[PDB]
Amino acid sequence: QTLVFITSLTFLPAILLMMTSFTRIIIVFGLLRNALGTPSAPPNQVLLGLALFLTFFIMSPVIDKIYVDAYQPFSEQKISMQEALDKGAQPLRAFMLRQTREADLALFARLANSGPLQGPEAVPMRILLPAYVTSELKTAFQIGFTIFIPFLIIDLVIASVLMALGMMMVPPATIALPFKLMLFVLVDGWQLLVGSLAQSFYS
């Protein structure tokens, strides 16, 4: 092909990431830096890197299945391009389905007006994607609010202390920042954040 081909070259690397993960991971970060002020990292640069590293780290076993389950048997003989699509697709399906909400399913299957369904995997390819995305958004924002809390605590505390002494005049927005960074680092929790994302993915 030519035209639609190049088109696919444009869209594809967006889709693949969308197809998998990483859309829920980044938002956690952006929510990070939105606490503790400025960018405090090169958003288009490093926080793309880290958030990619995790993603590969998580989805790895699925992949290893996919290869062991496909190329090495596809190289040589048996299936060609058909139960390739079947046997390689189905792990994606099941995987994705695991974290999907129950409702958004009913929502989009309803709007598209699909008849009686039997195979969950037989629920077609396209249908899953948006419900998946939306769900994962909900999850994401949840996790974010779980993040913020101690910091809000911080600002309230310091502001209060100031209010106690007649400090009304002074803008506590400045003072709290070094503490934020201190009591983030002294408790090491950055590890706790990357892990907390790692396990709480599925559990």
């Binding site: 209010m163 106690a164 002494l165 007649g166």
Partner: protein, 89 residues
Amino acid sequence: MTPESVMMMGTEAMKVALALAAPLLLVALITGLIISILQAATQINEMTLSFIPKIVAVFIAIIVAGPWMLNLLLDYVRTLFSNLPYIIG
């Protein structure tokens, strides 16, 4: 899209805001009023003082009131996303 309907929007919403914010700041008032009175009659007037009690009260407030306040929003928010296809017309 009558200006009348557009008015009904505000008429409802601003009353919702009344519902939410009303109790809290009332308790704030009553607090600073009472202590501030005690700032007379053996005067003893500094500056902040009654501030600290005012943090107690509000803190209690969300405890006591809490969930049903939420319910308010939970209702009306939904109703909005309810009528949206009728808002076009």
